[PDB]
């Protein structure tokens, strides 16, 4: 883990998080 | 645009209408709702929830 990163994640873990990602459609379903 | 009264969203639901007398944008949003969950201990321990 990297202390400088606020989320406390390893440099490799950051790359994985920023690669999958996912009136808007989400709100339409909720109603 | 002119001559354009109603409105629709991605899932084909009426989300906006135009007032007949004073033409204006009138968004329609349903009022809040959701589920309810009850947290309880055993009924032989207490009755608070």
UniProtKB/Swiss-Prot annotation, chain A:
Q: Where is this site: Cleavage?
A: 9-10
Q: What does this protein do?
A: Precursor of the fusion protein processed in the biosynthesis of the S protein and the formation of virus particle. Mediates fusion of the virion and cellular membranes by functioning as a class I viral fusion protein. Contains two viral fusion peptides that are unmasked after cleavage. The S2/S2' cleavage occurs during virus entry at the cell membrane by host TMPRSS2 or during endocytosis by host CSTL.
Q: What's the protein called, per UniProt?
A: Spike protein S2
> Can you name the source organism?
Severe acute respiratory syndrome coronavirus 2
**Which part of the entire sequence is included in the shown chain?**
807 to 855 of 1273
């Amino acid at each position: 883990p990297d202390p400088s990163k606020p989320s406390k994640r390893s440099p490799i873990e950051d790359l994985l998080f920023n690669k999958v990602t996912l009136r808007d459609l989400i709100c339409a379903q909720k109603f | 645009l002119p001559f354009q009264q109603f409105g629709r969203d991605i899932v084909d639901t009426t989300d906006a209408v135009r007032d007949p007398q004073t033409l204006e944008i009138l968004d329609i949003t349903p009022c809040s709702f959701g589920g309810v969950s009850v947290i309880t201990p055993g009924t032989n321990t207490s009755n608070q929830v």
